[PDB]
């Protein structure tokens, strides 16, 4: 009995960890996007921008 | 055409000539901006297949 919990929470820790690395891939290029995103803003701060650049 | 001593050809060719060159002025602006619009298409092109990998 004992042994077969402990059976059942090494799949439920496989399961969690599959969508867990999952989420950090693309909360890392989130991070980037946003990084670079912000980049972009401060160089619309730029006081030399003609209408049309 | 010759505008050699014949005004209202003389002026008037300037004039096209003018037009002609707002209008290139123009036409850079809007290759220039095509330009930019491929350059993004680029770098996302480049971040999306690192992701996918």
């Given at each position: 009995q004992?042994q077969?919990?402990n059976?059942?929470?090494?799949?439920?820790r496989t399961?969690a960890?599959?969508?867990?690395s999952?989420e950090e891939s693309?909360l890392?290029?989130?991070?980037?996007?946003?990084?670079?995103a912000?980049?972009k803003?401060?160089?619309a701060g730029?006081?030399?921008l003609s209408?049309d650049? | 055409?010759?505008?050699?001593?014949?005004?209202?050809e003389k002026?008037k060719?300037?004039?096209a000539?003018d037009?002609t060159n707002?209008?290139?002025?123009?036409?850079?602006?809007?290759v220039?901006?095509?330009?930019a619009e491929?350059g993004?298409?680029?770098?996302?092109?480049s971040?999306?297949?690192?992701?996918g990998?």
């Amino acid at each position: 009995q004992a042994q077969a919990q402990n059976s059942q929470y090494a799949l439920a820790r496989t399961f969690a960890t599959q969508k867990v690395s999952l989420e950090e891939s693309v909360l890392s290029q989130v991070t980037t996007a946003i990084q670079t995103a912000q980049e972009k803003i401060v160089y619309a701060g730029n006081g030399t921008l003609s209408d049309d650049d | 055409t010759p505008v050699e001593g014949n005004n209202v050809e003389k002026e008037k060719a300037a004039a096209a000539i003018d037009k002609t060159n707002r209008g290139l002025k123009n036409s850079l602006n809007n290759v220039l901006t095509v330009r930019a619009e491929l350059g993004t298409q680029l770098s996302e092109l480049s971040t999306l297949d690192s992701l996918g990998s």
